[PDB]
Amino acid sequence: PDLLTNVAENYVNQDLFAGIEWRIDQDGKPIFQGCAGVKDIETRTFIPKNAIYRIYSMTKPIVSFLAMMLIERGVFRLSSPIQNFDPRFKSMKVIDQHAHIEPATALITIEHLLTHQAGFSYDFSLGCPISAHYRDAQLIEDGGRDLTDMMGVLAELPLVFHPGTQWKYSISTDVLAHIIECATGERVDDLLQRLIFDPLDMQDTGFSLPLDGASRLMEVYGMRSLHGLPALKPAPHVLVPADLGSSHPTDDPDFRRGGHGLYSTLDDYMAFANMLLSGQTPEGETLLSPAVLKLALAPRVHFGARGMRINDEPFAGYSWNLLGRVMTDVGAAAYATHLGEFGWSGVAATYFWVDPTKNMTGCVMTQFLGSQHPIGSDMQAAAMSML
Amino acid sequence: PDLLTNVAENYVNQDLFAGIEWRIDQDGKPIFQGCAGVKDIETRTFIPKNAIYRIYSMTKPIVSFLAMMLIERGVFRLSSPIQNFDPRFKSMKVIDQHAHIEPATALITIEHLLTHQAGFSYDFSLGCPISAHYRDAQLIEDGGRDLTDMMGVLAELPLVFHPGTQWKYSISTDVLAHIIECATGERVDDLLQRLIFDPLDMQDTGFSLPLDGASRLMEVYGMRSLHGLPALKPAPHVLVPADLGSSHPTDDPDFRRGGHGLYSTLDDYMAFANMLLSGQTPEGETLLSPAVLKLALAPRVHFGARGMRINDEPFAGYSWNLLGRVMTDVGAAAYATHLGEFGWSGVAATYFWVDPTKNMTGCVMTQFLGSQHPIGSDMQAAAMSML
Amino acid sequence: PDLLTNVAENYVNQDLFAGIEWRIDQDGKPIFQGCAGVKDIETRTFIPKNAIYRIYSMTKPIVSFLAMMLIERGVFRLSSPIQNFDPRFKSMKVIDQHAHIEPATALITIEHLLTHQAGFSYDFSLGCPISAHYRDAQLIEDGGRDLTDMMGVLAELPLVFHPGTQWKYSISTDVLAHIIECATGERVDDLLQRLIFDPLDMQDTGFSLPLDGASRLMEVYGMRSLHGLPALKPAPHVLVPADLGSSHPTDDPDFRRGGHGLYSTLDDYMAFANMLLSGQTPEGETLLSPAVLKLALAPRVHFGARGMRINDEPFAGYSWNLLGRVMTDVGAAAYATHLGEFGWSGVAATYFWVDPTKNMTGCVMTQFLGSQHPIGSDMQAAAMSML
Ligand SMILES: CCOC(=O)[C@@H](C)c1cccc(C(=O)c2ccccc2)c1
Ligand SMILES: CCOC(=O)[C@@H](C)c1cccc(C(=O)c2ccccc2)c1
Ligand SMILES: CCOC(=O)[C@@H](C)c1cccc(C(=O)c2ccccc2)c1
DSSP track, A21-88: EEEEEETTEEEEEEEEEEEETTTTEEPPTT-BEE-GGGHHHHHHHHHHHHHHTTS--TT-BGGGT-GG
Q: What residues contact residue B55 under an 8 Å CB cut-off, 6+ apart?
A: B262, B263, B264, B269, B346, B348, B350, B365
Chain B contact present for A116, CB below 8 A: no
Judge: B99–A125 Cβ closer than 8 Å, yes or no: yes
A190 alpha carbon – ligand 1 mean position (Å): 25
Could you tell me the resolution of this structure in angstroms?
1.8
How far apart CA C301 and CA C113 sit, in angstroms, is 12
Chain B contact present for A100, CB below 8 A: yes
Beta-carbon contacts below 8 Å between A and B: 75
Q: What residues contact residue C13 under an 8 Å CB cut-off, 6+ apart?
A: none
Beta-strand pair B342-343/B324-327: antiparallel
Q: Find the domain containing B35 and state its range.
A: 1-387
What's phi and psi for B200, nearest 5 deg?
Answer: -95, 5
Q: Is the CB of A259 under 6 A from ligand 1?
A: yes
Q: Which residue of A has its CA nearest to C334?
A: A78
Contact predicate C272/C23, CB 8 Å: no
Q: How far is B224 from chain A (nearest CA, A)?
A: 16
Q: Which atom of ligand 1 is nearest to the CA of A122?
A: 5
How far apart CA C296 and CA C64 sit, in angstroms, is 9
Q: Which residues pair with B169 in a beta bridge?
A: none
Contact predicate C37/C44, CB 8 Å: no
Distances (CA, A) of C381 to A305, A326, C65, C254, C359: 35, 23, 26, 38, 16
> Which helix (H) or strand (E) covers residue C23, if one does?
strand C19-26
The residue among B62, B40, B48 whose CA lies nearest residue B207 is B62
What's phi and psi for A221, nearest 5 deg?
Answer: -115, 160
Contact predicate B363/B352, CB 8 Å: yes
Beta strands per DSSP E along B316-377 = 318-321, 324-327, 342-343, 351-355, 360-365
Q: What is the 3-class SS of C144-177, one letter each residue?
A: CCCHHHHHHHHHCCCECCCCCCCCCCCCHHHHHH
Contact predicate B384/B364, CB 8 Å: no
Q: What residues contact residue C236 under an 8 Å CB cut-off, 6+ apart?
A: C223
| Amino acid (one-letter) located at B112 | H
The residue among C108, C110, C50 whose CA lies nearest residue C264 is C50
Q: At what angle do helices A172-184 and A147-155 cross, to 10 degrees?
A: 120
Q: What residues contact residue A285 under an 8 Å CB cut-off, 6+ apart?
A: A199
* CB under 8 A, 24+ apart: contacts of C221-224: C221/C17, C221/C18, C221/C367, C221/C368, C221/C369, C222/C348, C222/C368, C222/C369, C222/C370, C222/C371, C223/C369, C223/C370, C224/C369, C224/C370
Count how many domains chain B has. Answer: 1
How far apart CA A37 and CA A20 sit, in angstroms, is 6
- The H helix count followed by the E strand count for chain B is 10, 13
| Amino acid (one-letter) located at C178 | H
Distances (CA, A) of C379 to A109, C6, C23, C367: 20, 10, 10, 15
The residue among B158, B153, B139 whose CA lies nearest residue B91 is B158
Residue A99 CB neighbours (<10 A): 20
Residue C114 CB neighbours (<10 A): 26
- Cα B187-B193-B196 angle, rounded to 5 deg: 120
Taking 3-state DSSP, the helix, strand and coil percentages for chain A, each rounded to the nearest 5, stand at 30, 20, 50
- Cα A310 to chain centroid distance, Å, stands at 13
- Cα A68 to chain centroid distance, Å, stands at 16
* Neighbouring C-alpha atoms within 13 Å toward the C-beta of B92: 28
Which bound ligand lies closest to the C-alpha atom of C141?
Answer: 3
Contact predicate B188/B62, CB 8 Å: no
Contact predicate A384/A336, CB 8 Å: yes
How far apart CA C68 and CA A8 sit, in angstroms, is 64
Beta-strand pair A308-310/B308-310: unpaired
- What 3-state class would DSSP assign to B286? strand
Residue to mutate among B124, B133, B232, with most A CBs inside 10 A, is B232
How far apart CA A104 and CA A93 sit, in angstroms, is 5
How far apart CA A287 and CA A46 sit, in angstroms, is 36
- DSSP assignment string, B5-33: HHHHHHHHHTTS-SEEEEEEEETTEEEEE
How big is chain B by its Cα radius of gyration, in Å? 20
* Neighbouring C-alpha atoms within 13 Å toward the C-beta of B219: 20
Q: Which residues pair with A309 in a beta bridge?
A: A314
Contact predicate A170/A106, CB 8 Å: no
- Is residue B196 classed exposed, middle or buried when 0-12, 13-18 and 19+ CB atoms within 10 A define those classes? buried
Q: Which residue of C has its CA nearest to A322?
A: C331
What's phi and psi for C54, nearest 5 deg?
Answer: -80, 115
Q: Which atom of ligand 2 is nearest to the CA of B346?
A: 1
Beta-strand pair B308-310/B263-265: unpaired
- What 3-state class would DSSP assign to C3? helix
Q: Which bin fits B116, alpha (ψ -120 to 50), beta or left (φ > 0)?
A: left
The residue among B376, B382, B378, B385 whose CA lies nearest residue B324 is B376
* Neighbouring C-alpha atoms within 13 Å toward the C-beta of C59: 27
Residue B317 CB neighbours (<10 A): 22
CA terminus-to-terminus distance, chain B: 11
The residue among B282, B369, B253, B362 whose CA lies nearest residue B18 is B369
Contact predicate C338/C387, CB 8 Å: no
Distances (CA, A) of C350 to C183, C189, C202, C362: 31, 21, 17, 11
Contact predicate A344/A61, CB 8 Å: yes
- Most distant CA pair in chain A: distance in Å? 59
Q: Which bin fits A89, alpha (ψ -120 to 50), beta or left (φ > 0)?
A: alpha
Q: What is the DSSP letter of A196?
A: I
What's phi and psi for A243, nearest 5 deg?
Answer: -100, 110
Beta strands per DSSP E along chain B = 19-26, 29-37, 52-54, 93-95, 101-103, 263-265, 308-310, 313-315, 318-321, 324-327, 342-343, 351-355, 360-365
Q: Which bin fits A364, alpha (ψ -120 to 50), beta or left (φ > 0)?
A: beta
| Amino acid (one-letter) located at B133 | H
How far apart CA B56 and CA B59 sit, in angstroms, is 6
Contact predicate C283/C275, CB 8 Å: no
Experimental method: X-ray
How far apart CA C130 and CA C133 sit, in angstroms, is 6
How big is chain A by its Cα radius of gyration, in Å? 20
Q: Using an 8 Å CB-CB cutoff, list chain C residues near A294.
A: 330, 338
Beta strands per DSSP E along B213-356 = 263-265, 308-310, 313-315, 318-321, 324-327, 342-343, 351-355
The residue among C294, C250, C45, C240 whose CA lies nearest residue C143 is C250
The residue among C72, C56, C121, C78 whose CA lies nearest residue C300 is C78
The residue among C326, C292, C279 whose CA lies nearest residue C78 is C292
Q: At what angle do helices A375-386 and A3-13 cross, to 10 degrees?
A: 150
Distances (CA, A) of C59 to C55, C64, C207, C346, C363: 7, 9, 10, 8, 14
Residue A301 CB neighbours (<10 A): 18
Q: What residues contact residue A43 under an 8 Å CB cut-off, 6+ apart?
A: none
Q: What residues contact residue A167 under an 8 Å CB cut-off, 6+ apart?
A: A115, A116, A117, A301, A303, A308, A320
Q: What residues contact residue C14 under an 8 Å CB cut-off, 6+ apart?
A: none
Residue B83 CB neighbours (<10 A): 17
Give the residue ranges of DSSP H helices in chain A: 3-13, 59-72, 110-115, 131-137, 147-155, 172-184, 188-192, 266-275, 290-297, 375-386
Q: Is the CB of A220 under 6 A from ligand 1?
A: no
- What 3-state class would DSSP assign to B259? coil
Q: What residues contact residue B276 under an 8 Å CB cut-off, 6+ apart?
A: B61, B65, B293, B323, B342, B354, B361
Give the closest of A72, A78, A299 to C385, CB-based. Answer: A72
Q: What is the DSSP letter of B265?
A: E
How far apart CA B147 and CA C49 sit, in angstroms, is 90
Q: Give the total residue count for chain A.
A: 387
Q: Which bin fits A307, alpha (ψ -120 to 50), beta or left (φ > 0)?
A: left
Chain C contact present for A60, CB below 8 A: no
- CATH code at position B231: 3.40.710.10
Give the closest of A101, A132, A158 to B132, CB-based. Answer: A132
Contact predicate B366/B349, CB 8 Å: yes
What's phi and psi for A289, nearest 5 deg?
Answer: -65, 160
Residue C86 CB neighbours (<10 A): 18
Torsion, Cα of C83, C85, C88, C94 (10° steps): -30
How far apart CA B273 and CA B360 sit, in angstroms, is 9
Q: Which residue of B has its CA nearest to A136?
A: B229
- What 3-state class would DSSP assign to C135? helix
How far apart CA B325 and CA B314 sit, in angstroms, is 12
The residue among C105, C93, C153 whose CA lies nearest residue C129 is C93
- Cα C220 to chain centroid distance, Å, stands at 17
- The H helix count followed by the E strand count for chain A is 10, 16
- Cα A311 to chain centroid distance, Å, stands at 15
Distances (CA, A) of C25 to C22, C268, C379, C383: 10, 13, 14, 10
Beta-strand pair B360-365/C19-26: unpaired
Q: Is the CB of B56 under 6 A from ligand 2?
A: yes
* CB under 8 A, 24+ apart: contacts of C299-307: C299/C326, C299/C328, C300/C115, C301/C115, C301/C116, C301/C117, C301/C167, C302/C328, C303/C167, C307/C332
The residue among C75, C150, C159 whose CA lies nearest residue C110 is C75
Torsion, Cα of C285, C290, C291, C292 (10° steps): 60
Residue C200 CB neighbours (<10 A): 19
- Cα B177 to chain centroid distance, Å, stands at 13
